[PDB]
Amino acid sequence: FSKEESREFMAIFPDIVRDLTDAGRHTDIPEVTKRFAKVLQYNVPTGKKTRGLSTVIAYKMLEKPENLTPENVRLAGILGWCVELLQASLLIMDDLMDRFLAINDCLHVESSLYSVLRKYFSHLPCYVPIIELFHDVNFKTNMGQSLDALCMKDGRPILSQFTMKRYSSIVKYKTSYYTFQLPVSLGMYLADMYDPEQHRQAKTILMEIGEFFQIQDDFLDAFGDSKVGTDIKEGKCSWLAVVALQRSNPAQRQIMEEHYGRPEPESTQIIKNLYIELGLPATFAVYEEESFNIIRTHIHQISKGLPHDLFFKIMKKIYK
Amino acid sequence: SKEESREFMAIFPDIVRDLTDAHTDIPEVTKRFAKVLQYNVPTGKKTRGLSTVIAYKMLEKPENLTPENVRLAGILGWCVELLQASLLIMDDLMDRSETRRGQPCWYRQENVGFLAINDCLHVESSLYSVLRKYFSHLPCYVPIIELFHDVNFKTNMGQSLDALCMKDGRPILSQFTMKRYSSIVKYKTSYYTFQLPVSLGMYLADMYDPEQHRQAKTILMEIGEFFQIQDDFLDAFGDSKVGTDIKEGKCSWLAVVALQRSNPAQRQIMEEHYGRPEPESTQIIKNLYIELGLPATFAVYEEESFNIIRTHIHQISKGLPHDLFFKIMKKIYKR
Numbered sequence: 001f002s003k004e005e006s007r008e009f010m011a012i013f014p015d016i017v018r019d020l021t022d023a024g025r026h027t028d029i030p031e032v033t034k035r036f037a038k039v040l041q042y043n044v045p046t047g048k049k050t051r052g053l054s055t056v057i058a059y060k061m062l063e064k065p066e067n068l069t070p071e072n073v074r075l076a077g078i079l080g081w082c083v084e085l086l087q088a089s090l091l092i093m094d095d096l097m098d099r100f101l102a103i104n105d106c107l108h109v110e111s112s113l114y115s116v117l118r119k120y121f122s123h124l125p126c127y128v129p130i131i132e133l134f135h136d137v138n139f140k141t142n143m144g145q146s147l148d149a150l151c152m153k154d155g156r157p158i159l160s161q162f163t164m165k166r167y168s169s170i171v172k173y174k175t176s177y178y179t180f181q182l183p184v185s186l187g188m189y190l191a192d193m194y195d196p197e198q199h200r201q202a203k204t205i206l207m208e209i210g211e212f213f214q215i216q217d218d219f220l221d222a223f224g225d226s227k228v229g230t231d232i233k234e235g236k237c238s239w240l241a242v243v244a245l246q247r248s249n250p251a252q253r254q255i256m257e258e259h260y261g262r263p264e265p266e267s268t269q270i271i272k273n274l275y276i277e278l279g280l281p282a283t284f285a286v287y288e289e290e291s292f293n294i295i296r297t298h299i300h301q302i303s304k305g306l307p308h309d310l311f312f313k314i315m316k317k318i319y320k
Numbered sequence: 321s322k323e324e325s326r327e328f329m330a331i332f333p334d335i336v337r338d339l340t341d342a343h344t345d346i347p348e349v350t351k352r353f354a355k356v357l358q359y360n361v362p363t364g365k366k367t368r369g370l371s372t373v374i375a376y377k378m379l380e381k382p383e384n385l386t387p388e389n390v391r392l393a394g395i396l397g398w399c400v401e402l403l404q405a406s407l408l409i410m411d412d413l414m415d416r417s418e419t420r421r422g423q424p425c426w427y428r429q430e431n432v433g434f435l436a437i438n439d440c441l442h443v444e445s446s447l448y449s450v451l452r453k454y455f456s457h458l459p460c461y462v463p464i465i466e467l468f469h470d471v472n473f474k475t476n477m478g479q480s481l482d483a484l485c486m487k488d489g490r491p492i493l494s495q496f497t498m499k500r501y502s503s504i505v506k507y508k509t510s511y512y513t514f515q516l517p518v519s520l521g522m523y524l525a526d527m528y529d530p531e532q533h534r535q536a537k538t539i540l541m542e543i544g545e546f547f548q549i550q551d552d553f554l555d556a557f558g559d560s561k562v563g564t565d566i567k568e569g570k571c572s573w574l575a576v577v578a579l580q581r582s583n584p585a586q587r588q589i590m591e592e593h594y595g596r597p598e599p600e601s602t603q604i605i606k607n608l609y610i611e612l613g614l615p616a617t618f619a620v621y622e623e624e625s626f627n628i629i630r631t632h633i634h635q636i637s638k639g640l641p642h643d644l645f646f647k648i649m650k651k652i653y654k655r
């Protein structure tokens with residue numbers, strides 16, 4: 001993302017806060033409105049904002065050059081901030097589950113994106129497709145979070161649940177829909193691209209990119225150079241654990257059963273030692289090459305009048 | 321009405337099928353979501369859902385009241401019950417309550433706990449899927465979507481304002497003012513309990529006049545305030561549900577009026593004993609409420625508020641039916 005893109009995007013955030021905390025309306029509840037301004041200011045604008053900026057990039061690469069006015073690029077930025085409000089509601093739910101922030105702040109921040117959509121988009125043709133997309137992505141993300149939770153019982157990982165089929169479903173529902181599909185489908189709708197076949201072709205490639213993203217992330221959690229990775233300690237349904245269980249003989253399976261998802265640092269080292277023994281680094285190297293090649297092929301094959309450069313830009317951001 | 325109740329209840333199983341049995345690659349989580357809906361949504365009294373059907377039947381032109389349109393009103397009623405189910409799942413986790421209406425709180429069930437947050441967000445999100453299935457081709461679609469999102473935002477402001485009356489599990493009695501109490505009841509309860517069912521009935525009847533919605537809101541916020549004050553009164557003085565508002569340190573009408581009427585010695589009793597777990601501390605507060613004559617004060621408020629609201633309903637103008645607001649009044653005041 002360019003300096004211009006990053007700065008124009010960040011310039012919108014203070015307007016979003018004023019919009020949601022009823023600036024100019026003279027509210028009967030100033031103390032709780034002032035608190036909500038702090039909830040937004042403290043939790044929404046501080047990250048890398050990759051999902052929000054991806055919404056702007058998608059719109060710029062899908063729209064006709066002649067329709068790329070400062071006004072339309074700003075609307076794309078506002079949609080990007082709606083994605084970042086959803087991201088913030090999900091990160092807040094994570095902070096609450098890990099332990100100023102109240103439990104209902106995640107519901108409140110999620111609800112706030114619909115107020116922003118109504119303010120800026122209610123008179124445009126893309127309004128109902130956009131609100132229906134957010135509704136559907138919200139429901140699917142909740143299904144993904146619940147599927148992830150069904151891999152744990154009484155504080156212990158259920159290793160029988162750690163299948164590649166279940167892993168692929170968790171990544172798709174919990175992460176890929178809101179992280180990869182939502183920004184691109186928002187860009188398409190703002191560019192008045194409603195063709196189901198176009199949305200379907202984009203979704204197919206973006207779910208593939210999303211799966212590589214999460215597998216790379218899972219690999220680096222254990223084998224990256226250090227934040228310090230806690231997936232093993234937390235008993236997470238990670239690609240490493242799924243492939244470990246595929247490759248394990250009964251003795252190796254017993255090591256996973258005894259030491260996976262334990263608080264003792266020694267147990268994390270025992271699992272890392274097993275991942276090394278099982279050749280998960282070499283397996284990841286093969287997956288990375290084969291997955292990159294398949295995704296590059298599918299992007300080159302993209303039809304229905306969709307631009308390739310958008311998907312290559314997204315892919316190159318993940319693989320580098 | 322028996323017929324109205326049974327008609328309404330007959331819709332629920334279809335809504336569960338719409339949300340779980342219509343994502344074929346993830347059956348374990350759709351089966352679980354059916355159980356979340358079945359536990360939290362259809363048990364006990366469905367007053368808000370049924371009030372949506374009643375409001376519609378009193379707002380719509382008699383000739384337009386088909387079984388099909390009455391069923392759409394019922395589906396909107398269930399969307400209100402879906403919103404309520406989401407709010408109470410979350411509130412019970414926040415307040416660490418044991419039961420609601422005798423049922424163990426959802427978050428307390430095996431292997432839920434803080435996963436109740438995801439279930440809250442999931443149940444709330446689900447009502448928009450119901451709206452899309454049944455209303456996407458009707459003119460009322462976007463107004464109804466916008467009303468649900470706006471009421472959710474306002475209800476969250478109410479819950480957060482309620483929380484600003486507590487610090488580290490201790491009530492902040494300086495926050496217990498009638499103006500703060502009125503604002504909590506308006507945002508936290510009255511919007512989703514009273515405004516939402518009536519505004520849904522109006523939209524389904526193609527009544528979009530902002531002035532009509534404004535006139536309805538003014539009366540329904542007044543009725544909503546008496547409703548919660550009566551509820552607060554009966555928590556302490558009702559004949560045994562067992563009231564735990566004092567133990568929980570709630571910003572109740574009783575606590576607010578007690579602090580208004582208290583001399584400095586009586587204030588110190590509230591400061592020492594309000595929101596404490598000890599049964600003797602609840603007894604001390606109840607005894608203070610009796611000493612301060614809160615029963616007589618409630619009796620006077622009940623009479624005066626009934627007369628003021630009745631006068632305000634007589635003065636309602638535009639097309640709004642007076643009989644709807646009198647019927648709601650009769651249901652709350654029981655006269």
Ligand SMILES: CC(C)=CCC/C(Br)=C/COP(=O)(O)OP(=O)(O)O
Pocket residue numbers: 104107406407408410411412415417475476479508509570
């Ligand atoms: C946003 C959000 C989660 C709102 C909850 C609204 C409601 Br309704 C909360 C219930 O209110 P309260 O806890 O004061 O009494 P009780 O639990 O019925 O005894």
Ligand SMILES: [Mg+2]
Pocket residue numbers: 217218221
């Ligand atoms: Mg990770």
Ligand SMILES: [Mg+2]
Pocket residue numbers: 411412415417
């Ligand atoms: Mg409660």
Ligand SMILES: [Mg+2]
Pocket residue numbers: 411414415482
């Ligand atoms: Mg509460």
Ligand SMILES: [Mg+2]
Pocket residue numbers: 551552555
């Ligand atoms: Mg009560």
Ligand SMILES: [Mg+2]
Pocket residue numbers: 417
């Ligand atoms: Mg209670």
